């Protein structure tokens, strides 16, 4: 394998949502914007919109379920986010069960809980440092101001235009 990647930014360039409220952040979020160093715009087959459901457990970790529409079926990816060093920061639960994955970091950058959210991800897989940013939406659509702000923040982490994508809304699986 030979492969080139845009460097993961320093954590100082990734803000943290102040006084993060885990209870208010639960529920379904739509992925209305997706950016990252391993993410690429594919004009021939545009990425379809997928959803991620956060649900607080008793021990204050999240059962994180992502649901996407792939190959005419609904695929479900169930993961666990364990609370990290500061509120709004999380590490991946049961990391040993994922082969190659030596590191995983989640950081809630900004959110108003009832409309939108921005979450930063960083992961070292096979000694390759990947990072991504997701524009979460409570509905499938969001304003141009929020979308241009997501593009602005994505660029501030060294990501060009073609590494920023906006998944097209769909009705399959991500509703209900």
Interface residues toward Na ion, by CB under 5 A: 121, 123, 130, 132
CA distance 163 to 24: 30
For residues 81 and 121, which CB has a smaller minimum distance to Na ion in the complex?
Answer: 121
CA distance 155 to 112: 22
For residues 76 and 98, which CB has a smaller minimum distance to Na ion in the complex?
Answer: 98
Q: How far is the CB of 34 from Na ion (least distance, A)?
A: 10
Q: How far is the CB of 83 from Na ion (least distance, A)?
A: 19
Relative to beta strand 62-70, strand 73-83 is antiparallel
For residues 39 and 67, which CB has a smaller minimum distance to Na ion in the complex?
Answer: 39
For residues 132 and 174, which CB has a smaller minimum distance to Na ion in the complex?
Answer: 132
Q: How far is the CB of 130 from Na ion (least distance, A)?
A: 5
Q: How far is the CB of 5 from Na ion (least distance, A)?
A: 12
């Amino acid at each position: 394998s030979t492969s080139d990647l845009i460097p993961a930014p320093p954590l100082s360039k990734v803000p943290l949502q102040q006084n993060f409220q885990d209870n208010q952040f639960q529920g379904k979020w739509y992925v209305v914007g997706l950016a990252g160093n391993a993410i690429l715009r594919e004009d021939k087959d545009p990425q379809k919109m997928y959803a991620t459901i956060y649900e607080l457990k008793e021990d204050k970790s999240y059962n994180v379920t992502s649901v996407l529409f792939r190959k005419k079926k609904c695929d479900y990816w169930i993961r666990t986010f364990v609370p990290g060093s500061q509120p709004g920061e999380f590490t991946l639960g049961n990391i040993k069960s994922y082969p190659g994955l030596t590191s995983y970091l989640v950081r809630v950058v900004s959110t108003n809980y009832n409309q939108h959210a921005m979450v930063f991800f960083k992961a070292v897989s096979q000694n390759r440092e990947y990072f991504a940013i997701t524009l979460y939406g409570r509905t499938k659509e969001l304003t141009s101001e929020l979308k241009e702000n997501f593009i602005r923040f994505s660029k501030s982490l060294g990501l060009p235009e073609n590494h920023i994508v906006f998944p097209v809304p769909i009705d399959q699986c991500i509703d209900g």
